[PDB]
Amino acid sequence: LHPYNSRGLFEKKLMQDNKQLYQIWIVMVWLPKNVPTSKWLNSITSGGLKSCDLDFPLRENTNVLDVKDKEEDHIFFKYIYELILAGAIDEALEEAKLSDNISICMILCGIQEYLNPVIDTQIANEFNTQQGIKKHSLWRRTVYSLSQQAGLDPYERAIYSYLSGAIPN
Amino acid sequence: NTTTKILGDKILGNLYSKVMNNSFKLCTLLIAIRGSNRDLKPSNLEKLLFINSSKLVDVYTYVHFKVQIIELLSYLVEAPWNDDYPFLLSFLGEAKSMAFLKEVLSDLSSPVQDWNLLRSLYIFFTTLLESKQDGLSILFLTGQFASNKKINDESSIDKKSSILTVLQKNSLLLDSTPEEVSCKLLETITYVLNTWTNSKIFIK
């Protein structure tokens, strides 16, 4: 427990050694589509595309790829906002993955703190491999820049508010 | 859930299911034999149990498969499961769900209006009418599902310990198709209507 830890055992001890914060966490947490995936065909042909990624969307217009998955960044994110107060984020991961996103779904694996048999000793036994981010605080302040990003329309970011603690957007 | 579930490939479905579909019949062979009790068993009792296998479900939005879902639960109950019920239903995969499982007691005929000759009729009884106790017998044939609980008082109100309030259902699972699974319980149920005093609260 004690002697030297990652960030994973800190968070456990926090919740251990108070019980009004632990209840506060439990309150907020307590209260289907078929998508074939793929992109990047139709984009190069009309104009430019030039590099494949949903970071092309962020260098300029968000009309540059297929626009029936521009649909999905509104709509399946709306499903995700019902989900996060029904609890979890790995639930929301499984729906992000049907949203035709597959590198913007890495942000929901980002929310994990470092759980490791190299730096935890009671989380070294329900895992035998590295999990999460050990730069989880630079992750938190960088997913918080998106909560204010003004290129990001509100139907993406409102969960990026919430991933770093929720401004009411 | 459904990702890439298409009216192109419905060919992948005879792959994705049919892997664990072998595992099914390797088990439920052991009970089906009826006349020559117990067979080869891998260990597989411990395996394939609980919330698990079921996750294949949602093809109820698109077909890769659409009848291979129905199998699991009907198969995955075994003879030692006349004492306890592992949790092969209670929670299931994203979105949609098996619910054509009591339309194996009847026809599957409720969507179409014609009977499509649904296979499972057999293997459904292989483990319904040959495996006792709250589980598949509080869900089908009287009850409402939340197993190993049924007290009509008639027996202790303590959390099962004296067992005559639940036998009343399992007595209608004692049929001749059962071999030895039935053949001690047939002596347990004699009590319920036994004239000495027993039929004074036991005729529920």
Curated annotation (Swiss-Prot), chain A:
Q: Give me the Gene Ontology terms describing cellular component.
A: chromosome, telomeric region; nuclear envelope; nuclear membrane; nuclear pore; nuclear pore outer ring
**Keyword terms of this UniProt record:** Coiled coil, Membrane, mRNA transport, Nuclear pore complex, Nucleus, Protein transport, Translocation, Transport
Tell me which Gene Ontology terms the entry assigns under biological process.
Answer: double-strand break repair; mRNA export from nucleus; mRNA export from nucleus in response to heat stress; nuclear pore localization; nucleocytoplasmic transport; positive regulation of DNA-templated transcription; positive regulation of transcription by RNA polymerase II; post-transcriptional tethering of RNA polymerase II gene DNA at nuclear periphery
Does the keyword section mention RNA-binding?
no
Gene Ontology MF annotations = identical protein binding; structural constituent of nuclear pore
Its domain of life? Answer: Eukaryota
Record's subunit section: Component of the nuclear pore complex (NPC). NPC constitutes the exclusive means of nucleocytoplasmic transport. NPCs allow the passive diffusion of ions and small molecules and the active, nuclear transport receptor-mediated bidirectional transport of macromolecules such as proteins, RNAs, ribonucleoparticles (RNPs), and ribosomal subunits across the nuclear envelope. Due to its 8-fold rotational symmetry, all subunits are present with 8 copies or multiples thereof.
Additional notes on this entry: Present with 8580 molecules/cell in log phase SD medium.
Q: Per its record, how is this protein called by name?
A: Nucleoporin NUP84
- According to the record, which residues of the full protein are present here? 96 to 273 of 726
Curated annotation (Swiss-Prot), chain B:
Domain of life of the organism encoding this protein:
Eukaryota
Protein's cellular compartments: Nucleus, Nuclear pore complex; Nucleus membrane
- Assembly and oligomerization: Component of the nuclear pore complex (NPC). NPC constitutes the exclusive means of nucleocytoplasmic transport. NPCs allow the passive diffusion of ions and small molecules and the active, nuclear transport receptor-mediated bidirectional transport of macromolecules such as proteins, RNAs, ribonucleoparticles (RNPs), and ribosomal subunits across the nuclear envelope. Due to its 8-fold rotational symmetry, all subunits are present with 8 copies or multiples thereof. Interacts with POM152 and NIC96.
- Homology family: Belongs to the Nup188 family.
Further information in the entry reads:
Present with 11700 molecules/cell in log phase SD medium.
The entry's function note states: Functions as a component of the nuclear pore complex (NPC). NPC components, collectively referred to as nucleoporins (NUPs), can play the role of both NPC structural components and of docking or interaction partners for transiently associated nuclear transport factors. NUP188 probably plays an important role in NPC assembly and organization.
The name under which this protein is listed is: Nucleoporin NUP188
Gene that produces this protein: NUP188
